[PDB]
CSV table of C-alpha atoms and ligand atoms in Angstrom, one decimal:
chain,number,residue,atom,x,y,z
A,1,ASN,CA,90.5,106.6,107.8
A,2,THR,CA,91.5,110.4,107.1
A,3,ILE,CA,93.2,113.1,109.3
A,4,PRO,CA,90.4,115.9,109.0
A,5,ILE,CA,92.2,119.4,108.3
A,6,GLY,CA,90.1,122.8,108.7
A,7,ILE,CA,89.3,125.4,106.3
A,8,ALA,CA,87.9,128.2,107.9
A,9,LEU,CA,87.8,130.8,104.5
A,10,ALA,CA,85.2,133.4,103.6
A,11,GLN,CA,83.6,131.7,100.5
A,12,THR,CA,79.8,133.8,100.8
A,13,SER,CA,79.9,137.9,101.3
A,14,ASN,CA,82.0,140.0,99.4
A,15,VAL,CA,85.2,138.7,101.3
A,16,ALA,CA,84.7,135.8,99.2
A,17,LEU,CA,86.0,138.0,96.4
A,18,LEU,CA,89.3,137.1,98.1
A,19,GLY,CA,88.1,133.8,100.3
A,20,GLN,CA,87.2,132.4,96.8
A,21,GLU,CA,90.6,132.3,95.5
A,22,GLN,CA,92.3,130.6,98.4
A,23,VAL,CA,89.3,128.2,98.7
A,24,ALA,CA,90.7,127.3,94.9
A,25,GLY,CA,94.7,126.9,96.2
A,26,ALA,CA,93.3,124.8,99.1
A,27,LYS,CA,91.6,122.1,96.8
A,28,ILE,CA,94.8,122.0,94.8
A,29,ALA,CA,96.8,121.1,97.5
A,30,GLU,CA,94.2,118.3,99.0
A,31,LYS,CA,94.4,116.7,95.6
A,32,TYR,CA,98.3,117.0,94.8
A,33,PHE,CA,99.1,115.8,98.4
A,34,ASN,CA,96.6,112.8,98.7
A,35,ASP,CA,98.1,111.9,95.2
A,36,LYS,CA,100.9,111.4,96.9
A,37,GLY,CA,99.8,109.5,99.6
A,38,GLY,CA,98.8,111.9,102.0
A,39,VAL,CA,100.3,111.9,105.5
A,40,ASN,CA,102.4,108.4,105.3
A,41,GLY,CA,99.5,106.6,103.2
A,42,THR,CA,96.7,108.2,105.5
A,43,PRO,CA,94.8,110.6,103.6
A,44,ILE,CA,93.9,114.3,104.6
A,45,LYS,CA,90.2,115.6,104.3
A,46,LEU,CA,90.0,119.3,104.2
A,47,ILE,CA,86.8,120.5,105.9
A,48,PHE,CA,85.4,123.6,104.6
A,49,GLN,CA,83.4,125.4,107.1
A,50,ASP,CA,82.7,129.2,105.7
A,51,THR,CA,83.3,132.3,107.8
A,52,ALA,CA,81.3,134.8,105.9
A,53,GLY,CA,82.6,138.0,106.1
A,54,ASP,CA,82.7,139.4,109.7
A,55,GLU,CA,83.7,138.1,112.9
A,56,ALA,CA,80.9,136.5,114.7
A,57,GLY,CA,81.0,134.2,111.4
A,58,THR,CA,84.6,133.3,111.8
A,59,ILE,CA,84.4,132.5,115.5
A,60,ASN,CA,81.4,130.2,114.8
A,61,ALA,CA,83.4,128.2,112.2
A,62,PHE,CA,86.4,127.8,114.1
A,63,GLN,CA,83.9,126.4,117.3
A,64,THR,CA,82.5,123.9,114.6
A,65,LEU,CA,85.5,123.0,113.1
A,66,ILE,CA,87.2,122.4,116.6
A,67,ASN,CA,84.3,121.0,118.5
A,68,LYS,CA,82.4,119.3,116.2
A,69,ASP,CA,84.7,118.5,112.9
A,70,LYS,CA,87.5,117.4,115.6
A,71,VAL,CA,89.8,118.7,113.2
A,72,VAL,CA,93.7,118.9,113.8
A,73,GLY,CA,94.2,122.5,112.4
A,74,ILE,CA,92.8,125.3,111.1
A,75,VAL,CA,93.8,127.5,108.1
A,76,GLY,CA,92.1,130.5,108.1
A,77,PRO,CA,90.3,132.8,108.1
A,78,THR,CA,90.8,135.0,105.3
A,79,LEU,CA,91.2,138.6,106.9
A,80,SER,CA,93.0,139.8,109.3
A,81,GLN,CA,90.0,141.5,110.9
A,82,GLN,CA,88.6,138.3,111.5
A,83,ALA,CA,91.6,136.9,112.8
A,84,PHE,CA,92.2,139.1,116.0
A,85,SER,CA,88.7,137.9,117.0
A,86,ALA,CA,88.7,134.4,116.3
A,87,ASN,CA,91.9,133.2,116.7
A,88,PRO,CA,92.4,133.8,120.2
A,89,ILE,CA,89.5,130.7,120.6
A,90,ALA,CA,91.8,128.5,118.5
A,91,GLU,CA,94.8,129.5,120.9
A,92,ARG,CA,92.6,129.0,123.9
A,93,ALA,CA,91.4,125.9,122.5
A,94,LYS,CA,95.3,125.0,121.9
A,95,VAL,CA,94.2,124.3,118.5
A,96,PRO,CA,97.0,125.0,115.4
A,97,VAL,CA,95.7,128.3,112.9
A,98,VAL,CA,98.1,129.0,110.0
A,99,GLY,CA,96.6,132.0,108.3
A,100,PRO,CA,97.4,132.0,104.4
A,101,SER,CA,96.6,135.7,103.5
A,102,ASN,CA,96.7,137.7,107.3
A,103,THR,CA,99.0,140.4,106.6
A,104,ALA,CA,98.2,142.8,109.3
A,105,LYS,CA,100.7,144.0,112.0
A,106,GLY,CA,100.3,141.1,115.3
A,107,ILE,CA,99.0,138.5,113.8
A,108,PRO,CA,101.5,135.9,114.9
A,109,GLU,CA,101.5,137.5,118.3
A,110,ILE,CA,98.3,136.4,119.0
A,111,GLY,CA,99.4,133.3,120.9
A,112,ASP,CA,101.8,130.2,120.2
A,113,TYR,CA,99.4,128.6,118.3
A,114,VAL,CA,98.7,130.8,115.3
A,115,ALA,CA,101.3,131.2,112.7
A,116,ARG,CA,101.2,132.8,109.2
A,117,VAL,CA,102.6,131.4,105.7
A,118,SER,CA,102.0,135.4,104.3
A,119,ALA,CA,104.4,137.9,104.7
A,120,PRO,CA,103.2,141.0,106.5
A,121,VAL,CA,102.5,144.4,105.2
A,122,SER,CA,105.5,145.7,106.5
A,123,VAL,CA,107.7,143.6,103.9
A,124,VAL,CA,105.0,143.4,101.0
A,125,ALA,CA,103.8,147.2,100.4
A,126,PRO,CA,106.8,149.0,100.5
A,127,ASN,CA,107.7,147.5,96.7
A,128,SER,CA,104.5,148.8,95.3
A,129,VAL,CA,105.8,152.4,96.0
A,130,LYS,CA,109.3,151.6,94.9
A,131,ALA,CA,107.8,150.4,91.6
A,132,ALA,CA,105.7,153.7,91.0
A,133,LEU,CA,109.1,155.6,91.2
A,134,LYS,CA,110.8,153.5,88.7
A,135,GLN,CA,108.2,154.5,86.5
A,136,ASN,CA,108.1,157.8,87.0
A,137,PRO,CA,110.6,159.3,89.1
A,138,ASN,CA,109.0,162.4,89.5
A,139,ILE,CA,106.1,161.6,91.6
A,140,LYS,CA,106.3,164.0,94.0
A,141,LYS,CA,102.4,164.6,95.6
A,142,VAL,CA,100.9,161.3,96.9
A,143,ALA,CA,97.1,161.1,98.5
A,144,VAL,CA,96.2,157.8,100.3
A,145,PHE,CA,93.1,156.2,100.8
A,146,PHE,CA,91.8,153.5,103.7
A,147,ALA,CA,89.0,151.6,105.2
A,148,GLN,CA,88.9,152.6,108.7
A,149,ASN,CA,87.0,149.5,109.5
A,150,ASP,CA,89.6,146.6,108.3
A,151,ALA,CA,92.3,146.1,110.9
A,152,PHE,CA,94.4,145.0,107.5
A,153,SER,CA,93.6,148.2,105.9
A,154,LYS,CA,94.8,150.4,108.8
A,155,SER,CA,98.1,148.3,109.4
A,156,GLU,CA,98.6,148.2,105.7
A,157,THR,CA,98.1,152.5,105.4
A,158,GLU,CA,100.6,153.1,108.0
A,159,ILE,CA,103.4,151.1,106.3
A,160,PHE,CA,102.4,152.9,102.8
A,161,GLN,CA,102.3,156.5,104.6
A,162,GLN,CA,105.8,155.9,106.4
A,163,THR,CA,107.2,154.4,102.9
A,164,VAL,CA,105.9,157.6,101.6
A,165,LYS,CA,107.7,159.8,104.0
A,166,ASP,CA,110.8,157.6,103.8
A,167,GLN,CA,111.1,158.3,100.1
A,168,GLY,CA,110.7,162.0,100.5
A,169,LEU,CA,107.2,162.6,98.9
A,170,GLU,CA,104.6,164.6,99.8
A,171,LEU,CA,101.5,163.2,101.6
A,172,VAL,CA,98.8,165.5,100.7
A,173,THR,CA,95.9,163.8,102.2
A,174,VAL,CA,94.9,160.8,103.9
A,175,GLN,CA,91.4,160.0,103.2
A,176,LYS,CA,89.1,157.6,105.2
A,177,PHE,CA,85.8,155.3,103.9
A,178,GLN,CA,84.7,151.9,104.8
A,179,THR,CA,85.0,148.6,103.0
A,180,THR,CA,81.1,148.8,102.6
A,181,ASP,CA,80.8,151.8,100.9
A,182,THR,CA,80.4,151.7,97.3
A,183,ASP,CA,80.5,156.4,96.5
A,184,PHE,CA,83.7,157.8,97.2
A,185,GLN,CA,82.8,160.8,95.2
A,186,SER,CA,83.6,163.2,97.9
A,187,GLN,CA,87.1,161.8,99.3
A,188,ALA,CA,88.0,161.4,95.8
A,189,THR,CA,87.0,164.7,94.5
A,190,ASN,CA,88.7,166.2,97.5
A,191,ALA,CA,92.1,164.3,97.0
A,192,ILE,CA,92.1,165.0,93.3
A,193,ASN,CA,91.7,168.7,93.9
A,194,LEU,CA,94.9,168.4,95.8
A,195,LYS,CA,96.8,167.3,92.5
A,196,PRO,CA,98.3,164.0,93.3
A,197,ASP,CA,100.6,161.9,91.3
A,198,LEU,CA,100.4,158.6,92.9
A,199,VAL,CA,97.4,157.4,94.7
A,200,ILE,CA,97.1,154.7,97.0
A,201,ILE,CA,94.7,152.7,98.4
A,202,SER,CA,94.0,150.3,101.3
A,203,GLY,CA,90.8,148.6,101.2
A,204,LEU,CA,89.2,145.1,99.7
A,205,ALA,CA,88.2,144.1,96.3
A,206,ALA,CA,84.4,145.6,95.4
A,207,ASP,CA,85.7,148.9,97.3
A,208,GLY,CA,88.9,148.9,96.3
A,209,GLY,CA,87.9,148.5,92.7
A,210,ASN,CA,85.0,151.2,93.1
A,211,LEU,CA,87.4,153.4,94.4
A,212,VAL,CA,90.0,153.1,91.5
A,213,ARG,CA,87.0,153.7,88.7
A,214,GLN,CA,85.6,156.8,90.4
A,215,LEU,CA,88.8,158.1,90.8
A,216,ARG,CA,89.7,157.7,86.7
A,217,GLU,CA,85.9,158.8,86.1
A,218,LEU,CA,86.7,162.0,88.0
A,219,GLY,CA,89.6,162.8,85.7
A,220,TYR,CA,92.7,161.5,87.9
A,221,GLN,CA,95.5,160.8,85.7
A,222,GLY,CA,98.3,159.5,87.8
A,223,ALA,CA,99.7,156.5,89.7
A,224,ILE,CA,97.5,154.4,91.4
A,225,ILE,CA,98.5,151.6,93.9
A,226,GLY,CA,96.6,148.9,95.1
A,227,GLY,CA,97.2,147.1,98.3
A,228,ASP,CA,96.7,143.3,99.0
A,229,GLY,CA,92.8,143.8,99.3
A,230,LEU,CA,92.6,144.5,95.7
A,231,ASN,CA,95.2,141.7,94.8
A,232,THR,CA,92.2,139.7,92.5
A,233,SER,CA,91.1,139.4,89.0
A,234,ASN,CA,87.9,140.3,90.9
A,235,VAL,CA,88.3,143.8,90.5
A,236,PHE,CA,88.3,143.4,86.6
A,237,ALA,CA,84.7,143.6,86.5
A,238,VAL,CA,84.6,146.4,88.9
A,239,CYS,CA,86.5,149.2,87.4
A,240,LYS,CA,86.9,147.4,83.8
A,241,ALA,CA,89.3,149.2,81.5
A,242,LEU,CA,89.3,151.7,84.2
A,243,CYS,CA,91.6,149.3,86.2
A,244,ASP,CA,94.3,149.6,83.9
A,245,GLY,CA,97.7,150.2,85.4
A,246,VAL,CA,97.3,149.7,89.5
A,247,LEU,CA,100.4,148.4,90.9
A,248,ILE,CA,99.9,145.4,93.1
A,249,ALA,CA,102.9,144.1,95.7
A,250,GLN,CA,103.0,140.7,95.3
A,251,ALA,CA,104.1,137.5,97.6
A,252,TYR,CA,104.3,135.1,95.1
A,253,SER,CA,105.4,134.3,91.6
A,254,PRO,CA,103.7,132.3,88.9
A,255,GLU,CA,107.1,132.2,87.0
A,256,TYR,CA,109.2,131.5,90.7
A,257,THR,CA,111.0,128.4,89.2
A,258,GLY,CA,110.6,126.1,92.6
A,259,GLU,CA,109.5,122.6,91.6
A,260,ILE,CA,106.4,122.5,93.6
A,261,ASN,CA,105.6,125.6,92.3
A,262,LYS,CA,105.5,124.0,88.1
A,263,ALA,CA,103.5,121.7,89.9
A,264,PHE,CA,100.7,124.3,91.4
A,265,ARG,CA,101.3,126.5,88.4
A,266,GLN,CA,100.7,123.5,86.1
A,267,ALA,CA,97.5,122.4,87.8
A,268,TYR,CA,96.0,125.8,88.2
A,269,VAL,CA,96.0,126.8,84.5
A,270,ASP,CA,94.9,123.6,83.2
A,271,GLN,CA,91.9,124.1,84.9
A,272,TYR,CA,91.0,127.8,85.5
A,273,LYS,CA,93.1,129.1,82.2
A,274,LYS,CA,95.3,131.9,83.8
A,275,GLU,CA,98.0,132.1,86.1
A,276,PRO,CA,97.7,131.3,89.9
A,277,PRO,CA,96.9,134.2,92.2
A,278,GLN,CA,99.3,135.3,95.4
A,279,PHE,CA,95.8,134.1,97.4
A,280,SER,CA,95.6,130.4,95.9
A,281,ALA,CA,99.3,129.9,96.3
A,282,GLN,CA,99.6,131.0,99.5
A,283,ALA,CA,96.0,128.7,100.5
A,284,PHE,CA,98.2,125.8,99.1
A,285,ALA,CA,101.3,126.4,100.9
A,286,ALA,CA,99.1,126.6,104.2
A,287,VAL,CA,98.0,123.3,103.6
A,288,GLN,CA,101.5,122.1,102.5
A,289,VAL,CA,102.9,123.1,106.3
A,290,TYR,CA,100.1,121.0,107.5
A,291,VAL,CA,100.3,117.6,105.4
A,292,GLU,CA,104.3,117.6,105.5
A,293,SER,CA,104.4,118.5,109.5
A,294,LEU,CA,102.1,115.9,110.0
A,295,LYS,CA,103.9,113.6,108.0
A,296,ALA,CA,107.1,114.3,110.3
A,297,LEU,CA,104.9,114.1,113.3
A,298,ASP,CA,103.8,110.4,112.3
A,299,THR,CA,106.9,109.4,111.3
A,300,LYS,CA,108.2,110.0,114.9
A,301,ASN,CA,104.9,109.5,117.1
A,302,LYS,CA,102.1,107.8,115.3
A,303,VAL,CA,99.8,110.1,114.6
A,304,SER,CA,96.7,107.3,114.6
A,305,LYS,CA,97.4,106.6,118.6
A,306,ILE,CA,97.8,110.1,119.7
A,307,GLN,CA,94.5,111.8,121.2
A,308,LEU,CA,93.1,114.8,120.0
A,309,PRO,CA,94.1,117.2,122.2
A,310,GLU,CA,97.8,116.1,122.7
A,311,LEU,CA,98.0,115.4,118.8
A,312,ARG,CA,96.7,119.3,117.9
A,313,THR,CA,99.5,120.4,120.7
A,314,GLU,CA,102.2,117.8,119.0
A,315,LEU,CA,101.1,119.2,115.5
A,316,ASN,CA,101.7,122.6,116.4
A,317,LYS,CA,104.8,122.4,117.9
A,318,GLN,CA,106.2,120.3,114.8
A,319,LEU,CA,104.7,122.8,112.1
A,320,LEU,CA,106.5,125.8,113.7
A,321,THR,CA,110.1,123.7,113.2
A,322,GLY,CA,109.5,122.7,109.8
A,323,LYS,CA,111.6,124.3,106.8
A,324,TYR,CA,109.1,124.0,103.6
A,325,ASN,CA,109.6,124.0,99.8
A,326,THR,CA,106.5,125.7,98.7
A,327,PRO,CA,105.2,127.7,95.8
A,328,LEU,CA,105.8,130.8,97.8
A,329,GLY,CA,109.3,129.8,97.8
A,330,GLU,CA,111.4,128.4,101.0
A,331,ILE,CA,110.2,129.3,104.0
A,332,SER,CA,110.0,128.6,107.8
A,333,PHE,CA,109.1,130.0,110.7
A,334,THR,CA,110.1,132.1,114.0
A,335,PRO,CA,109.3,130.9,117.2
A,336,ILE,CA,106.6,132.9,117.2
A,337,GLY,CA,104.8,132.1,113.7
A,338,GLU,CA,106.0,134.5,112.1
A,339,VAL,CA,106.9,133.8,107.8
A,340,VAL,CA,110.7,133.4,107.1
A,341,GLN,CA,110.4,134.1,103.8
A,342,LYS,CA,112.8,136.1,100.9
A,343,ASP,CA,111.4,137.1,98.0
A,344,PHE,CA,108.9,139.7,96.7
A,345,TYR,CA,107.4,141.3,93.3
A,346,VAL,CA,104.7,143.9,92.0
A,347,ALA,CA,102.6,143.4,89.5
A,348,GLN,CA,100.7,145.8,87.2
A,349,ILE,CA,96.9,145.4,85.9
A,350,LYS,CA,96.5,144.9,81.6
A,351,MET,CA,93.4,145.2,80.6
A,352,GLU,CA,92.6,145.1,77.4
A,353,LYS,CA,90.8,148.3,75.8
A,354,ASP,CA,87.0,146.7,76.0
A,355,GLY,CA,87.5,146.5,79.7
A,356,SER,CA,86.1,142.7,79.6
A,357,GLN,CA,89.9,140.8,80.1
A,358,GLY,CA,92.8,141.5,82.0
A,359,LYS,CA,95.8,140.4,83.5
A,360,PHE,CA,98.7,141.3,86.3
A,361,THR,CA,101.7,142.0,84.7
A,362,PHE,CA,104.3,140.5,86.7
A,363,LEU,CA,107.6,144.1,86.3
A,364,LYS,CA,111.5,142.3,86.2
B,1,LIG,C1,93.6,141.0,101.8
B,1,LIG,C2,93.5,140.7,103.0
B,1,LIG,C3,93.3,139.0,103.1
B,1,LIG,C4,94.9,141.0,103.7
B,1,LIG,N1,95.9,140.2,103.9
B,1,LIG,C5,94.1,140.7,105.1
B,1,LIG,O1,95.2,140.4,106.1
B,1,LIG,O2,93.3,140.9,105.8
B,2,LIG,MG1,102.4,132.9,117.2
């Protein structure tokens, strides 16, 4: 006997350039927690249902997990775009959802069954603008790009634009693109003609990487910030040496000294031969929230005897009250499921000259 927890992430499509790191973190969590006896001796069982890259696929994944797989709760989905469509399904069904990486404004507000462990754009994004200004205090002109079809990108770009204004900088253009575009020559040229000192990009990974590469190809030599959708080593293949120097805010640091981060990091590095990325740590934290909440609930009200609808409702109630020492740091939730988290960072892509290898360097 095991306790089923649903994992609904993008395992296919270009959205999997983000989702695959989340899957990796979830699997590390499953082993970590099951090796510790699961829920008071009862193992958990992660049930993975691929969402693919759109809303329909996410809705289908959620419905399958809820109805066929009888899960006690869901971790997912990957994108805020998917969450706004699918999370109401879980809300209506009274099944908890813990978002690992949905950072758009409004996610926890979807309902009483929706929480997230991922700090939102309003607190994450401004960090990278400040870091760019530290590296070049003479930045004056800023060009902004965003994916107009993606909910998170639209939410993130508003924060970047407001931050640019509040820092007293000149916003010289806002250019739009689609996440499915591969070519950005006209937008990139129109921005470059305005002589920006800083370029900020809110898109996802393939699109963001292609845009970075093209800006450099077209002669742009200024600073570049990527938003959360570029926050993956999967961009390295796309922009190669021309990824070098891109600044990306972080809601996780491998060097954070919390005991569980040490264990998570060691497990990750031993397997993948590089530092754990933010998305992996966030997925681990989401699974941790479920395991620790299930343990607390089970101690007070043995879960093997609770029928599923009540188990789901009691688990949701429990998780919202918990405090968790996770790889992300000490976190908890507001009464509506927003994460409470203290520390943020900025990292910078450092490519090797040949362009075939790189890493994220954390700024001090
Ligand atoms: C990069 C992506 C996972 C983004 N944080 C979102 O909310 O969709
Ligand atoms: Mg909520």
